[PDB]
Every structure is written in C-alpha cells, then in structure tokens.
Amino acid sequence: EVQLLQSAGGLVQPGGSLRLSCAASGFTVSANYMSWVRQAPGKGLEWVSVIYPGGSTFYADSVKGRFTISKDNSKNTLYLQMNSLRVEDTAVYYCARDLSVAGAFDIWGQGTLVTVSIVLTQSPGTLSLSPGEKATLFCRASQTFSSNYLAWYQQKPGQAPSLLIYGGSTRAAGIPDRFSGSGSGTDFTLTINRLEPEDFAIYYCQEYGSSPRVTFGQGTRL
Amino acid sequence: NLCPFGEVFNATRFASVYAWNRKRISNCVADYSVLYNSASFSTFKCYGVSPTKLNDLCFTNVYADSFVIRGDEVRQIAPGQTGKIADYNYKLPDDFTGCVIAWNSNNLDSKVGGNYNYLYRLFRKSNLKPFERDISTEIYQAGSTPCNGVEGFNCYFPLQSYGFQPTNGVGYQPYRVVVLSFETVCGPKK
Ligand SMILES: *[C@@H]1O[C@H](CO)[C@@H](O)[C@H](O)[C@H]1NC(C)=O
CATH class of the missing domain: 2.60.40.10 (Immunoglobulins)
Structure with a gap:
C-alpha cells in the first residue's frame, strides 16, 4: 500500500530556515512527478512547486527564489529547501504524487504545520x-x-x-x-x-x- | 529550380510532435522574401543568423523540421527553455544557426467533435539530447512493480492525445510550427 510520511512541524521566527521531507514507498520519486500544495488557514489550496523527471523545475511566481526543491534518489525522498520566510507563509504543506492528465494527485501525504513568529x-x-x-x-x-x-x-x-x-x-x-x-x-x-x-x-x-x-x-x- | 520550401510550408497535413519528420532541401536557390512578406505568419522570431542577410548568406545544407503543438506552448520551442513539450518531445540546442516559424491553423486541423490523431509523449526517465527523436512506445513504469505489458496501477501508457476543439483558442487552439536549421544553397545568384 502506497503511503507518504512527512516530518516538518515547528515554530520559526521571520527570516529563519527549516526544511521538509517526504518518504515514498511503492513508487520511485525519480520517475514519478512531485508537487507541493500549500493551504493557508481559512484559505483555499495554493500551488508551490512541481518536479518532472530530470532537472526541470518550476515555481509559483508568488514565492520565487525563497523556496528551493530537490530530490534524493538515495533515501527515496524529496526536500523543500526554505531559506527565507515571511509573515504570510504560515500554513500547512502537503506533498503528493502527480500524474497530469491520467489522474491528478492520486495519493497525498498527512500535512505538516509551520508557523512564523485564469480563476x-x-x-x-x-x-x-x-x-x-x-x-x-x-x-x-x-x-x-x-x-x-x-x-x-x-x-x-x-x-x-x-x-x-x-x-x-x-x-x-x-x-x-x-x-x-x-x-x-x-x-x-x-x-x-x-x-x-x-x-x-x-x-x-x-x-x-x-x-x-x-x-x-x-x-x-x- | 526554385527551392521547395514554398511547397513544404504550404501543404495539407503534418505529423504529430512526437513523430516529427525532416526534409533535406537539396541544391536549389531560395528567396525568403516570400517568407518575410507573408501576412499569414504570426510568430517569426528569428534567432542567430541576421534576418535581412538570410538570403545573402550561403550554407552547406538546410534542414526543415515541422510538427503540430498547442498555441500556448509555441514559446517553449525557443532555445534555452524547458517544459513538457521541449524537454521530452522535441529538444532544441542552446544556439542554432537557424530559426523557427509559427502560424495559426484551426479550421484545417480541428473538428467540432475533437481530433485524436495528434499525440504527445508525457512520461520519460530522462531528457533528450538536441535533435533527438524517439518513436518507441514502451509501457512506462513507476519502477517498483515491473510491468510485463499490462496497463493498470504503476504502469501507464507514455503517449497522450491532444484534444482540439473550437474554444477560446488563447492557448488551446492548434498552432502549426516549422523549424529551419542551417548547417550548397544560395538565394540570389546574381
Ligand atoms: C500558399 O497558398 C495560398 C493559398 O491561398 C496562396 O495564396 C499563397 O500564395 C501560397 N504561398 C504562400 C507563401 O502563402
């Protein structure tokens, strides 16, 4: 049974840095897609990142440069490097596997909470x-x-x-x-x-x- | 012998992006003023070789490539860009002594019920070297459970089919794209 796990909870002051992780079992991270969706408190879900197989990557223009995403085939995990924070970044982060047209975000993680200090x-x-x-x-x-x-x-x-x-x-x-x-x-x-x-x-x-x-x-x- | 570029651009039907075809324009004279003055052209951003002296310059040989892609993805054909259509289906080098031509085509390529003939590759383990083509359709796998050739969980068909329909047409409208690359051809021959 495919299942994801995340360990990112904590409290950080503005200007701090904290990293995220997602362990994947049953599907290789390198081959499949990846995506981080962010849900602000009382707000709708918002997109952050996508990783295709290979080094291609794209970010959300709302948060560009402050976030870095990388994969690791050794531990079968992907990291969401986060060097810069602000006051509005307080939300919960979900990492999930993407399949584009042939299904979309079939399996999701468990969600981690972090706090600071077309339509x-x-x-x-x-x-x-x-x-x-x-x-x-x-x-x-x-x-x-x-x-x-x-x-x-x-x-x-x-x-x-x-x-x-x-x-x-x-x-x-x-x-x-x-x-x-x-x-x-x-x-x-x-x-x-x-x-x-x-x-x-x-x-x-x-x-x-x-x-x-x-x-x-x-x-x-x- | 006028070069058959005016007969290859002005044609009935073309191939899909994943099965793009090439043609070797042989020894012939070529006047690109007909390319420049044509009003039907929409995007004509020409990189590398200077635009006006294109007829003046002479090269060893010229290669013509073409395919059909979505309107919103015409930008990614440009060099030094990445995406689902340029990284996998058709990759273009960092700098090439040529340039691409794009013009809208909706009536000749889209039908009200939708067209299924055009396909584009979605899954692949790694990117492609410049000017690399791959037709083989093998069942792509997640890598944990080996796939013997049966579709299902963790085993998906790599190819997917575009859907073209009369719509807003901002990005979903089908656009025809032709790529010219320069390596015995001279235009004026005064
Ligand atoms: C292409 O075909 C059209 C058909 O109407 C013709 O008018 C045109 O002269 C041809 N050549 C070019 C370069 O458009």
Missing part, C-alpha cells in the same frame, strides 16, 4: 441538507477548456484530501457509485445521489490545463 469560483456555498435529499454542486470557469483537465476533491476535517473524480467523470477505484460528475461549456456540475452520514465534508474543484500551473477553487462545504 475558478464555486457558487452554492453552504447547501445544507438532511441525508435523505440529493445534493448537486456548481463551480464554473472564466475560460472554457475541453473538460478533460478537471478534478474533484473531498477533504474531511482534520485529515488530508483524497481523489474522487478525474478527467471528466472518470471515477477512481474504490469510490462508491454515489458520486458522479457531468460538466460542459463554462458550467461544471457534480451530483451526489444519496448523502451518507460520513459524506459530510468539504469539496474542491481543480484545473490542470496549464502545464506548469494548477489553480484551486475556493471550495464548497456541506
């Missing part, structure tokens, strides 16, 4: 319902695409997100038949036939159309 939108908001009724979600895109670059994610409180739908209604193995998706044009919709007691969670939309950049929506709760 997508989702309409429904709360959408509170009892288990009996049916729920449908709406998130639209300002620029149209072929809908093969979309993904749906769910995030139960106190844990890490997991994949639900990738590549335009193509579900994942082990996902129940309850979840389904259908989207065309500018408006993209996910529907849930029945609401189980455990299904109460927070859902996010994703777009990986841009090759080096992925944009995450604000997300909807249930």
Whole structure:
C-alpha cells in the first residue's frame, strides 16, 4: 500500500530556515512527478512547486527564489529547501504524487504545520441538507477548456484530501457509485445521489490545463 | 529550380510532435522574401543568423523540421527553455544557426467533435539530447512493480492525445510550427 510520511512541524521566527521531507514507498520519486500544495488557514489550496523527471523545475511566481526543491534518489525522498520566510507563509504543506492528465494527485501525504513568529469560483456555498435529499454542486470557469483537465476533491476535517473524480467523470477505484460528475461549456456540475452520514465534508474543484500551473477553487462545504 | 520550401510550408497535413519528420532541401536557390512578406505568419522570431542577410548568406545544407503543438506552448520551442513539450518531445540546442516559424491553423486541423490523431509523449526517465527523436512506445513504469505489458496501477501508457476543439483558442487552439536549421544553397545568384 502506497503511503507518504512527512516530518516538518515547528515554530520559526521571520527570516529563519527549516526544511521538509517526504518518504515514498511503492513508487520511485525519480520517475514519478512531485508537487507541493500549500493551504493557508481559512484559505483555499495554493500551488508551490512541481518536479518532472530530470532537472526541470518550476515555481509559483508568488514565492520565487525563497523556496528551493530537490530530490534524493538515495533515501527515496524529496526536500523543500526554505531559506527565507515571511509573515504570510504560515500554513500547512502537503506533498503528493502527480500524474497530469491520467489522474491528478492520486495519493497525498498527512500535512505538516509551520508557523512564523485564469480563476475558478464555486457558487452554492453552504447547501445544507438532511441525508435523505440529493445534493448537486456548481463551480464554473472564466475560460472554457475541453473538460478533460478537471478534478474533484473531498477533504474531511482534520485529515488530508483524497481523489474522487478525474478527467471528466472518470471515477477512481474504490469510490462508491454515489458520486458522479457531468460538466460542459463554462458550467461544471457534480451530483451526489444519496448523502451518507460520513459524506459530510468539504469539496474542491481543480484545473490542470496549464502545464506548469494548477489553480484551486475556493471550495464548497456541506 | 526554385527551392521547395514554398511547397513544404504550404501543404495539407503534418505529423504529430512526437513523430516529427525532416526534409533535406537539396541544391536549389531560395528567396525568403516570400517568407518575410507573408501576412499569414504570426510568430517569426528569428534567432542567430541576421534576418535581412538570410538570403545573402550561403550554407552547406538546410534542414526543415515541422510538427503540430498547442498555441500556448509555441514559446517553449525557443532555445534555452524547458517544459513538457521541449524537454521530452522535441529538444532544441542552446544556439542554432537557424530559426523557427509559427502560424495559426484551426479550421484545417480541428473538428467540432475533437481530433485524436495528434499525440504527445508525457512520461520519460530522462531528457533528450538536441535533435533527438524517439518513436518507441514502451509501457512506462513507476519502477517498483515491473510491468510485463499490462496497463493498470504503476504502469501507464507514455503517449497522450491532444484534444482540439473550437474554444477560446488563447492557448488551446492548434498552432502549426516549422523549424529551419542551417548547417550548397544560395538565394540570389546574381
Ligand atoms: C500558399 O497558398 C495560398 C493559398 O491561398 C496562396 O495564396 C499563397 O500564395 C501560397 N504561398 C504562400 C507563401 O502563402
């Protein structure tokens, strides 16, 4: 069973430096992709880095030069070197394996907390319902695409997100038949036939159309 | 014998990016004023050799390469840049005594239902040397569980197919790209 582990927790003053690690079992780091997604407190997920096989690398223009990413085939881990910090960097860091079109971020880590000292939108908001009724979600895109670059994610409180739908209604193995998706044009919709007691969670939309950049929506709760 | 560049640029269909083809322009005279004055051209950034004296200069031989790529990725063909289309599918050296030509092509290459004929490689263990082509389609593996040739977990098909459809066309519109490289050809011959 593939699983990731991270050890990065700590407290640092502004201008400090602390490093991150991610152990990988069942898949080689050198061959597969890598990605660090950052989630600010009370904010949506934001992209930080991607590593293709080979020395190619790209960063987010919001944080450029202050972050360095490297891989290590000896220990089967990748490091996120961090020499400079600021006051707004306080967030939780997630490292995950990427697969571009053929699946997107199939397995995630566990999340580590660090403290200092195109656009997508989702309409429904709360959408509170009892288990009996049916729920449908709406998130639209300002620029149209072929809908093969979309993904749906769910995030139960106190844990890490997991994949639900990738590549335009193509579900994942082990996902129940309850979840389904259908989207065309500018408006993209996910529907849930029945609401189980455990299904109460927070859902996010994703777009990986841009090759080096992925944009995450604000997300909807249930 | 006018050089057949005007017959190879002005053609019906081209090959995919991963299976790009080359042509050897033989001994012939070539006037590139038709290349410069053509309005249909969109991007004509010419590196290395000076633009105006291109017809004046003479070289041993000229090679013409071409393919079809997405509109947003036309920039990465330029030398000294990296990405999913330049690192793996078609790599170009740091400095080459030639330059590339790109012009939009949507009606002749996209259909409302989408086109599946064009493919681009996504997975590879290492980058390519300049001017290196690789056609072989072997089941790419994560490396932990050996793949005997059965698709599934940790075993994926390296090739993936672009989807071209009438859309916003900012980056998803198909763009045709032709690459000219200079190594017995002279234009004017006054
Ligand atoms: C290419 O074909 C078009 C077809 O309309 C023609 O008008 C043009 O002269 C040809 N040559 C060039 C360089 O465009």
